[PDB]
């Protein structure tokens, strides 16, 4: 790293600084003065102080990018958001008066919830006991299950079963199926849940 | 491991000179250059002909002043002129030094078609920087 350990990460939160001094707690007040002395890193290009910034949609864009082509990864994400937006408007005008109250049209609320319906609770880790590897169920951490949800959605879409379908139409179709708890990505979570509950007899091999 | 222009450590009875005590990675940090011309500058030429003259001059002086050279030569070029600067021991008689100055200056001036001047600096004994 070209930054020294002295350099601290910057805080882009715009509503934090505005906080009145009257609300500042004694511990928080101290921190603010301390940061003045500290050196701060330059904010990276990815994150700004905009009101539309979403850390989950920026991380999902970085996990699809290939070779630093972020203009294409971001383009696919926005096309997908617009495809989810246009498909729900088409399902809202053709719905009954009482069916329109249960139709979500915000593509973000769909993206965050669909990824939450794919997060597994427990995973399988190979442990070496008696010169053999056993896939014992282990509790996945919060980050791990948030990462697996994104990786599986991108692997399913990348999978070469759909012969000639553009990513925005594929990613949009999988996000709407996981929103209703359907599709292979959800099924892939169940298959990992069915193998962790069948091999619960080997839940003592692990130590941590 | 790297070996170039390095004097390996000894018990402590080996005397080395400043130039002999510094390795190649100090040539522009703690040492200068023994030859100074323009051949190697950007856009200059005749770098291969100034080099052959240096290799021969250092051998001509080593065999013409045997046992008398305390340290390496410092060759200097200013236009047509070539200046040889040397550190020599005081063992040899002065009469013989003046003979070698007029013989080497003249011989090398007719060989490289240039005015050659030699500047001796006698020292009692080989200056010692440290004992490796």
């Amino acid at each position: 790293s070209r930054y020294s350990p002295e350099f601290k990460d910057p805080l882009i939160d715009k509503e934090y600084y505005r906080k009145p001094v009257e609300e500042l707690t004694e511990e928080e007040k101290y921190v603010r003065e301390l940061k003045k002395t500290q050196l701060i890193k330059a904010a990276p290009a990815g994150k700004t102080s905009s009101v539309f910034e979403d850390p989950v949609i920026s991380k999902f864009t970085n996990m699809m990018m290939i070779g630093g082509n972020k203009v294409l990864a971001r383009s696919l994400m926005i096309q997908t958001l617009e495809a989810v937006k246009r498909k729900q408007f088409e399902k809202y005008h053709a719905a009954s008066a009482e069916e329109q109250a249960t139709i979500e049209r915000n593509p973000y609320t769909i993206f965050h919830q669909a990824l939450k319906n794919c997060e597994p609770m427990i995973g399988l880790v190979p442990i070496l006991k008696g010169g053999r590897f056993y896939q014992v169920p282990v509790p996945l951490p919060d980050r791990r299950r948030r990462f697996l949800a994104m990786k599986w959605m991108i692997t399913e879409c990348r999978d070469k079963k759909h012969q000639r379908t553009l990513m925005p139409e594929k990613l949009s179709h999988k996000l709407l199926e996981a929103f209703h708890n359907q599709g292979p990505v959800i099924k892939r979570k169940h298959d990992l849940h069915k193998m962790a509950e069948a091999n619960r007899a080997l839940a003592h091999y692990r130590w941590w | 491991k790297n070996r170039a222009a390095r004097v390996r450590v000894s018990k402590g009875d080996k005397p080395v000179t400043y130039e002999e005590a510094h390795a190649p990675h100090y040539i522009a940090h703690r040492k200068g250059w023994l030859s100074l011309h323009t051949g190697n500058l950007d856009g200059e030429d005749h770098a291969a002909e100034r080099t052959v003259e240096d290799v021969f001059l250092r051998k001509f002086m080593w065999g013409t002043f045997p046992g008398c050279l305390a340290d390496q030569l410092v060759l200097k070029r200013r236009g047509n002129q070539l200046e040889i600067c040397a550190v020599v021991l005081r063992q040899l008689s002065p009469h013989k030094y003046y003979f070698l100055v007029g013989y080497s200056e003249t011989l090398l001036s007719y060989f490289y078609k240039c005015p050659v001047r030699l500047h001796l600096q006698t020292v009692p004994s080989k200056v010692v920087y440290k004992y490796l």
Binding site: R2, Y3, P10, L11, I12, K14, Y17, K35, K36, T37, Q38, L39, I40, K41, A42, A43, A45, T48, S49, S50, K70, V71, R74 | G12, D13, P15, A28, H29, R30, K31, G32, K130, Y131
Partner: protein, 316 residues
């Protein structure tokens, strides 16, 4: 034995003091100065002209200093002709270090009987100069533990002077951005000019005090110059943070680098020039947000034996 440590006596150093004074009057005759008012800075300037050396190491260049700054301080003879050591703690080996611990421990006993920012404790390397004695790390810590113990107690006025000697000073540079001088053009409009740098891109930004939020990069509207939205977001960032969008007119000229290197360089220039039209408190928030710091991340060189800067050729 051929190798002997170069020992310099007082008589040798006394003869070196006379050669420098005479050499100091000769160097002034060469340069045509007055010998009397010939300081050491002029000697450093005259020796750098007469003996020009381009050696990167400044300790390997010609130097004509006073013999008290060249020759190191040496432990003086520690006994008379009779042979009795002057000091009573000579046989300890560290008579200077132990005489100090004996004095500090003696002041801590008197206290019982009758009963800060910008400063740092003398470093180990600086404490061996006051005593002319080699000291281990552990011995230095022991000494610091007694001084701190001294401070906690209700030390008298004299003791404060004693401790102060061992407390060196550190000049801390206030982490405050340097405001640019507001200028005025022919028409009378106020503005501030600053410069930025990102990778290989260099940018100059002029920020007018009053404007309608118009930005011209190299004479072209920013949206035309920057098609990618991300680049435009970087331009907005400084102004959005200080909640003053659509209030200034910017005229910048960026050269070098690429698409994303040019925006970063402009962001930093605008941000620096926008600190002159905001309060001190807002400038500190910009600093804590990473808007006034120059990103030092630049391309790393490739090494002769590797595929890349850090990537290695495949191991067979």
């Amino acid at each position: 034995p051929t190798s002997k440590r170069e020992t310099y006596t007082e008589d040798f150093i006394k003869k070196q003091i006379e050669e420098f004074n005479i050499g100091k009057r000769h160097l002034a005759n060469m340069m045509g100065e007055d010998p009397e008012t010939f300081t050491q800075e002029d000697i450093d300037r005259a020796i750098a002209y007469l003996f020009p050396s381009g050696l990167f190491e400044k300790r390997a260049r010609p130097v004509m200093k006073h013999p008290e700054q060249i020759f190191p301080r040496q432990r003086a003879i520690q006994w008379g002709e009779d042979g009795r050591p002057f000091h009573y703690l000579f046989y300890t080996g560290k008579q200077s270090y132990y005489s100090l611990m004996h004095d500090v421990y003696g002041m801590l006993l008197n206290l019982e009987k009758h009963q800060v920012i910008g400063s740092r404790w003398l470093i180990k390397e600086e404490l061996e100069e006051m005593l002319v004695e080699k000291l281990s790390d552990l011995d230095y810590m022991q000494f610091i533990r007694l001084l701190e113990k001294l401070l906690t107690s209700q030390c008298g006025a004299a003791e404060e002077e004693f401790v102060q000697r061992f407390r060196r000073s550190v000049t801390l540079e206030s982490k405050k951005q340097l405001i640019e001088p507001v200028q005025y053009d022919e028409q009378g409009m106020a503005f501030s000019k600053s410069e930025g740098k990102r990778k290989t891109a260099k940018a100059e930004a002029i920020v007018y005090k009053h404007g309608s939020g118009r930005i011209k990069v190299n004479g072209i509207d920013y949206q035309l110059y920057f098609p990618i939205t991300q680049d435009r977001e970087q331009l907005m960032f400084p102004f959005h943070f200080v909640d003053r969008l659509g209030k200034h007119d910017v005229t910048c000229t960026v050269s070098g680098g690429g698409r994303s290197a040019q925006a970063g360089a402009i962001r930093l220039a605008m941000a620096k020039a926008l600190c002159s039209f905001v309060t001190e408190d807002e400038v500190e928030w910009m600093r804590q947000a990473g808007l006034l710091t120059t990103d030092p991340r630049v391309r790393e060189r490739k090494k002769p034996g590797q595929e890349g800067a850090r990537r290695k050729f495949t191991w067979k």
